[PDB]
Amino acid sequence: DVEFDALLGSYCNTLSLVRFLELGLSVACVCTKFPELAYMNEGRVQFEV
Amino acid sequence: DGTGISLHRQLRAIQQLARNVQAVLGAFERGTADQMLHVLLEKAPPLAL
């Protein structure tokens, strides 16, 4: 059933569809799919000036 | 998920059934020798009787 949904219900239709990086907010937004984000305790970024 | 860790969270729980089932199916072989010493001692009249 999902073999049809990968063909039909995965693409090839909008009817009202937005992509985010289509939209022009994305110059504010770094966007990076980090899939294991559920498993993290903390997430650190170090800055040094 | 498609993450390697979610595939590896499985493997500990895969190996745990490798370690329980080999134990409890080993436990009947460990249990027959427990049963035989009872059912010998159930019919074992003590010597000097």
Q: DSSP letters of B4-26?
A: HHHHHHHHHHHHHHHHHHHHHHH
- Search chain A and give the residue with CA nearest B2: A35
A26: Cβ contacts below 8 Å, ≥ 6 apart: A20
Q: Assess contact for A33 and A43: CB atoms under 8 A.
A: no
Cβ–Cβ under 8 Å, residues A39 and B9:
no
DSSP, res A37: G
Q: Is B4 in the A-facing interface, judged by CB distances under 8 Å?
A: no
Q: Which residue has the tokens 């009947």?
A: B28
Contacts of B1 (CB under 8 A, 6+ apart): A35
| Chain mean position to CA B11 | 21
Best residue in A36, A37, A40, A41 to probe B by mutation, most B CBs within 10 Å?
A36
DSSP state of A19: -
> What is the longest distance spanned by two Cα atoms in chain B?
73
Distances (CA, A) of B45 to B4, B11, B20, B23, B39: 63, 52, 39, 35, 12
Q: What is the resolution of this structure in A?
A: 4.1
Dihedral sign, Cα of residue B45, residue B46, residue B47, residue B49: negative
The Cα B4–Cα B13 span in angstroms is 15
Gap between the Cα atoms of A42 and A5, Å rounded: 36
